Design a protein around this ligand. Structure first.
Ligand SMILES: OC[C@H]1O[C@@H](O[C@H]2[C@H](O)[C@@H](O)[C@H](O[C@H]3[C@H](O)[C@@H](O)[C@@H](O)O[C@@H]3CO)O[C@@H]2CO)[C@H](O)[C@@H](O)[C@@H]1O
Ligand SMILES: OC[C@H]1O[C@@H](O[C@H]2[C@H](O)[C@@H](O)[C@H](O)O[C@@H]2CO)[C@H](O)[C@@H](O)[C@@H]1O
Length: 313
């Protein structure tokens, strides 16, 4: 891989998110150790690991749940043994128990407390990357930037030097990074951020269906992926920052495969600012018809998109 980090999301611990705490093996699962080794064998050195804020910290501002922390640490052992980095993805959409950050129910400081606690646990783990928040939305770009700043500050106060992946609002879409239609863009709002540890990257997501939601197995053209990364890529370069494509996916059809090749090629060509990417998704709990799975079959076989991903890994 010409990029520093390439890999996949191992989805499952964030499943059935209505259920709190939920029960391990019933409502959610952590990955199998063999998942880590399978992806390592395909050249992937990075695993993004979604998990829920509510499951790791069952009361705001309170202690971490030790069983949940143990599950995360067990995944970290597997990643380390397979020479992989582990992105801790707080997979929460800027919400806690369905209430948005910035409401009276969930002050921005609560997110900083969560990350203070995780940083204290993982500050001495070089393999660990802090994915502050999956797809904030329903919060303005400046208000999210303030919440992100508080979180970065909290992490650095612990002495942690780990890479922090910082999203924007608007589901952190690459395509909409610079949009001012509805007010302040992510581009403008996030220029304010300061990381005293100088080890930050901006996390964007990009899907290729009509509304960039990844809800349909369509890529609207054979070039749309690279097209939608251009504005964000330029913003990174303009601001001397780095980026990370925390989620992206394409379905198994010719137009999508061309788009996939194009976007992977584009990131390699622009490796001065792209640190890497993690495909959405693998994990053992996707249904047979899920269009974006790269979890190997029970028969051991590779999924179709993996033949392309592996060429860039
Ligand atoms: O990106 C994955 C994420 O998608 C969420 O859907 C979002 C899309 O990300 C977002 O692009 C779309 O934005 C639209 C905007 O709200 C409209 O007002 C108008 O400007 O068009 C935009 C699309 O070009 O909004 C949808 C939500 O409606 C999924 O909800 C989420 O599950 C998923 O992870
Ligand atoms: O419907 C199956 C399964 O979906 C889980 O949510 C998925 C969702 O289907 C997918 O579109 C999105 O990209 O990822 C999420 C997982 O983060 C859901 O959590 C389960 O309750 C449900 O059984």
């Amino acid at each position: 891989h010409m990029l520093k980090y390439v890999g996949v999301n191992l989805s499952g611990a964030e499943f059935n998110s209505r259920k709190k705490p939920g029960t391990l093996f019933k409502d959610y699962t952590y990955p199998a150790a063999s998942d880590f080794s399978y992806f390592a064998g395909k050249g992937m050195n990075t695993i993004r690991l979604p998990f829920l804020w509510e499951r790791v910290q069952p009361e705001l501002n309170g202690p971490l749940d030790q069983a949940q922390l143990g599950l995360i640490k067990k995944s970290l052992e597997a990643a380390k043994a397979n020479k992989q980095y582990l992105i801790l993805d707080l997979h929460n959409y800027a919400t806690y128990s369905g209430k948005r950050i910035g409401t009276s129910d969930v002050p921005a400081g609560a997110l900083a407390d969560l990350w203070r606690r995780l940083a204290l646990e993982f500050k001495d783990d070089k393999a660990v990357i802090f994915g502050l928040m999956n797809e904030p939305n329903g919060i303005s770009a400046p208000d999210w930037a303030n919440a992100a700043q508080g979180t970065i500050t909290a992490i650095r106060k612990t002495g942690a030097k780990n890479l922090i992946l910082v999203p924007g609002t608007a589901y952190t879409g690459a395509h909409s990074w610079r949009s001012t239609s509805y007010g302040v863009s992510n581009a403008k709002a996030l220029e304010i951020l300061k990381d005293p540890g100088n080890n930050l990257a901006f996390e964007a997501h990009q899907y290729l269906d009509k509304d960039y939601s990844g809800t349909k197995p369509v890529c609207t053209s054979d070039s749309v992926g690279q097209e939608k990364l251009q504005g964000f890529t330029s913003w990174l370069r303009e601001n001397k920052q780095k980026g990370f494509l925390g989620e992206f996916a394409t379905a198994n059809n010719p137009v999508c495969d061309k788009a996939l090749e194009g976007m992977l090629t584009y990131m390699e060509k622009n490796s001065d600012v792209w640190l890497g990417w993690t495909w959405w998704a693998a994990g053992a709990w996707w249904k047979p018809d899920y269009p974006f799975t790269v979890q190997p079959g029970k028969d051991g076989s590779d999924k179709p998109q993996m033949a392309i991903l592996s060429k860039y890994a």
